[model samples]
Each structure stands twice: as structure tokens, then as C-alpha cells.
Target: RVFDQQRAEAAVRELLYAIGEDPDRDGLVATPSRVARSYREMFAGLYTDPDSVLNTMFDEDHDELVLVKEIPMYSTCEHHLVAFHGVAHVGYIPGDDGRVTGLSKIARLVDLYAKRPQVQERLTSQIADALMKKLDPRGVIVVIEAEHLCMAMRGVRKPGSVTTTSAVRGLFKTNAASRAEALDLILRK
Candidate 1:
């Protein structure tokens, strides 16, 4: 469902009261509306479908591994609504048909999945899955490494801790060498 700004503002005001803050106070009076607008942008991905961005693909004769590394990503943790920032590395081996898309679409794919509240694991898998389904690739690999503010600002509060997650499908899953090559490319400077 789409976000309701009025409802979100009300909810934010309620939250302020719940946290023992005065919602009507001078400093906080406009805070709820500001937060509501921010939420609309953060969760905008809910209205977007990742596969739609890959629809511009065209066939080419090249059938080698294509890798896009360090696609920067920013997402909110689903459980806490706090921010997580990271980079995603995406790669795939084209099918015999050699279907390839605009390189920017790969980055857009990451953004479509990341603009919503999410777990790094799910975000990684969703990107891999979308590439697999939309491109029918011979294999796909997605790796994400991030720092979650929910972890750093609370809980154990270990700053600088990073969480890494990955999803591998097709040859990238069954063939060790293929996976290793993708990992090597992702890790290289």
C-alpha cells in the first residue's frame, strides 16, 4: 500500500508522546511532518518493482561473465526502521542467448530493493532472484556488505561492525570456480 502522509504524521506525533516528548512543543511541533516526508522517500520502493528496470535488456553476442561491483546502497532495517548503508556487488553469466542490459539497470535494481525496509540477506537474494528471473541468466551472484545503525546505536553497540550477505544461483551456486571468480572480482580493488 502507498504511504499516507497525514497518517504518518499522526503516528509520529503519537510516537513522540509515547517517548515522553511533547509533540506540541516548539521544537517538536514540525518534527512529525518532517519525519512523515522522509518516510515517504525511504519506503518509496514499496511502490516499485525491481524487474521493471531490467525490461530494457537487449540481446548481444557476448556470453561471458558480466560483473558490476560496488553499487552503493542505502536501506532501512525492517525490524528497527534504522538506516543501513552498504555496497552491492552483482554479477552474472549470460545465457546462450547473451542477454545483457544497460549497466545502470543493475544499480537501479539494487536501489529498488534497498529503498524499502529490509534485511541485508533478503536484499541480496532479491537482487539475484530478479536478475535470474528477468534475464534468465546462466548464473547470478549478489553480495552485500553493510553497517546497520540498529546494531551500532543499540543492542551490543559495537561500532564499525559490518554484516555481509550473499546469494548465488544457477552456475554460481553449483560451480565452485564460477562463484570464486565472481568473488575475486568483487573483492579486487
Candidate 2:
């Protein structure tokens, strides 16, 4: 289904042949192996296990809003390897729930997806889904503001334009007051 080492090497040979590069030439002899290794290294995070990534979360004695903002992410568009760079802000309301998560976990979750190719909106929702499932919090909100290279670099060619995607779940979706409280809480800071 996906490109494997052998297939990647074969493809490189094809490319070299097409470009008139001798596959057996001294300079390009190891090209296949290099490309194969690069592919494995580049997409390593996609094979990561989601279960362990969002395994256990707890909400402790403090019933407050938890916010993790400015989480830097770098991903490629599935259609194009051009990069999309952004920051994600994740906020969840902690109730008398099962467990509260560690602060670093949020950043780790962001990094987990950042290592793969993704669309910005999907990235925002995936993180929202993970937080909702892991923390089972009162609410979960995720906002991602990014610049897609597909647009900024090649497609629409709009430079300096930022795209924002947001996802809200649980109380953030049903209760307006709670949602506003959480949103308002973040704005003041």
C-alpha cells in the first residue's frame, strides 16, 4: 500500500534512468539505499501507536481551565510535501473527572501529528478528539492557526495569509456559558 524500501529504491532507479543518470555510476550507486533510509526516517512518526500516545489522563483536585498554547507544529500536505507550519492552542475544562494530564503530554500530542503529513483542519480535530477521549473532560477546544505552503507557496500563492481551524467538544459544544467562560478566561491572558 505504502512505499516500502525495495519499492522506493526501485523508484529511485527509475528516476535516475529517466534523468539519464547511470544507476550503476559511482556517484549514484548508493542512491537507492539513501532514499530508502530517508523515507523511513521522514515518516517514522506515522507508525506511532495512538493508544500509548493518549493513554491515560486525570483531573485532580483543581477544577480549572487547562490551557496549552503556542504548540509549534510542522506537517506536509498529503497532496504535496510542501510544509505547513503553525501553532496549536488546546484548552480543556477540568471537572471532578477521572484524571488530569501532564502539561508535557499536550505538547507531545501536538508533536506526534506534526511529524506527519496532514491538513490543518484535520490536525486540529485529531487533537481535539484525542483530548476528549483521553481526558473525558467537561469540554475540549482546539484552535490551530497556520500557513499552508500549498497556498502560500504554490497554489493560491497568497503570502502572509494565515488559516485558522478550530474544534470544540463536550461542554464546549453544548453549554454556551461554559464555552464562553473558557474562551474568556484565555482571552484575558
Candidate 3:
């Protein structure tokens, strides 16, 4: 569904009231509308399908792994509606048909999945699953390491703690050696 800016603005104002803040005060009056606009951009992926970004592809003779690491990611945690920022490592082995997409498409795919409220685990798997389905890759692996604001700003309040999650599909799920090689590349500094 599409974002409703009016609803979001109203909700933000209500949230301010719930927190015992003056929503109508000069300093805060525009805050709700500003937040609503930001939410529109932040949640844009909710209106898009991740597979659509992988639309650009061509047949190539190469079947070796193509890995894109350290793609910047920013996502909202579904549980707390707070930001989780990190980098994603995505890699895939081309299918027998040698199908491959534009490298930037992989990064775009990551952003598409991340722009919605999500759990890191699901975000990882969704990226892998999309590549597996769209590219029909022989194998796909996605790794994400993120720092959640919810965890650092509240609860245990441990800042700088990173959470790692991964999803493996096809050959990457069955072949240890192949998985290891990809992980080595992804983790290498």
C-alpha cells in the first residue's frame, strides 16, 4: 500500500501528545509534517517490488561468483520503528544459462528490501530469494551486519554492537566449499 502523508502527520502529532510533548508549540508545530515527509521516503520500498529492480540482465559466459560487498544499507526495525544501519554483502553464482544482472541492480535490490520496516533476518533472506528467483542463480548468499538504534538507545543500551545475519540459497546452501569461498570474499577487508 502507498503511504498516506496526512495520516502519518496526524500519527506523529499524536505520538508527541502521547509523550507529553506540546505538538502545537512553535518549535514542534512543523515536526509532524517533517517526519511524515521523511517517512514517505524511508518507507518507499513498501510500494515497490524488489524483483523489478533486477530487470536488467544479460547472458554472459562467466559462471564464477559475482560478489558485491559493503553496499550501504539503512532500514527500519519493525519491532521498534527505529533505524538499523549497516552494509550488505551479496554474491551469486550464475545459472547454467549464464544469466547475470547489472551489478548496481544488486545494490538497488538491497535498498528496495531495506526501505520498509523489517527484521534483519528477513531482509537478508529476501535479497537472496529475489536473486534466486529473478536471476535463477545457481546459488545466492546475502550477509548483513547492522547496528540497531532500538538496541543501542534503549533496552540493554549497548552501543556499537553489531548483529549479523545471512541467507543462503541453492548451491550455497549445500556446498560447503562454495559457501566458504564466497564468505571469505565477503568478509575480507
Candidate 4:
């Protein structure tokens, strides 16, 4: 949202020209404007912090761990500007004080990072760190598996390969049993 529309448009126009295309051509005349708008949505998270979305917290008499699995994620790889698409599994144990968030907030958290150009490793870690900082959870675990177009459409060109990454905190990092259970829940069908 903090993006400069004029600058973005100009950049797109320059990109078109650099790619050996005429920006004023019929099919390309409006491309710069469209691309600018598209980028605004694509990078909206750059203007906002992930923890802000978890403001509507609740206190409930709940125990054990909370796991939201198979949350579909789509992000652009910062390295090549190509897409990586797949799912995320987030698990956390609420603080002893019983603070918990809406299930949808978990998905929103994923989008906060995914909407920006990112690497899978950092994205997974950011989600885990945000959950830990915002919720002050007893533990946190985040797992992501995605197929990157940068790898499939370019580079070695392995089309069907999926990259997997994970992040763990608190008990999930200190206690192997806790980590195993969380992973089992995430890995389950």
C-alpha cells in the first residue's frame, strides 16, 4: 500500500522496453498500469506487520496444541520473481494464560508473509516467529512444502519437485516428543 504507483508504472514501461517490446504498442499500451496495480496487491504486506492481524485475541479454557494444516499458500520467489505454490501447517500451544486466536487468523498470518516476494525458508521462520511473539505461545511449529517455479520453470527445471521447510520454537524445539506430535498432526491425512 505504500507503493508509488507512478514509479511502478514507469518501471513496468521500462521493463517492457528492456525486453525488446514497445510500451506504446496496442497490446502493451495498458500493461504498465495493470502491472503497477497487480504489484500493489502482490506486495501489500510490505506496508503492514503480521502481528497486527492477531489483535482480536480471546481467552479460553483450552489446552493441548492448536494446529491448522494444509493452508494453501502462494508467493513470489524474490530470487527470480517466479511463483511458489503449496500449503503450510502451523501448530502452537497457547500460553498458560489461555490466549488463543481465531483459526482464520492463522491463514491470514500465512498470507501476510506469502504476499511478499520471499524465500520459503524465511517465510516459514517468519510465520513461526510472529506466532511466538504475538501469542507468547508455549511452543510453535511451522512447516511449508511448495513447488517453486524458479526451480521448475528455470534452473535445473525439475517440474514436480517440492521444497519443504520448517521452523520450531520453545517446546517444539526443546522437547522432541512435542515436536514429533506436532509433526504427526501436520503430516496426517
* C-alpha lDDT values of all predictions: 0.88, 0.76, 0.90, 0.87
How well is each residue in 81-163 modelled by candidate 1, as lDDT tens digits?
89999899999888887778777988988998999989889999999999999888999999998988885676677888888
Candidates arranged by lDDT, highest first: 3, 1, 4, 2
State which candidate, 3 or 4, has the greater lDDT: 3
lDDT of 4: 0.87
Global Cα lDDT for candidate 1: 0.88
Instruction: TM-score each candidate.
Output: 0.94, 0.76, 0.95, 0.92
Task: Sum up the clashes in candidate 1.
Answer: 0
Candidate 3 ranges with C-alpha deviation above 4 Å: 155-157
- Kindly list the per-residue Cα lDDT of model 2 for residues 97-141, writing each as its tens digit: 656677677877887766676777888888888888777788899
lDDT of 3 by residue, 114-140 (tens): 999999999999899999998888999
Query: Higher-lDDT candidate among 2 and 3?
Result: 3
Question: Is 1 or 2 the stronger prediction by lDDT?
Answer: 1
Q: Pick the candidate with the highest TM-score.
A: 3
Using lDDT, give the best candidate's number.
3
The alpha-carbon root-mean-square deviation between model 1 and the true structure, to one decimal in Å, is 1.5
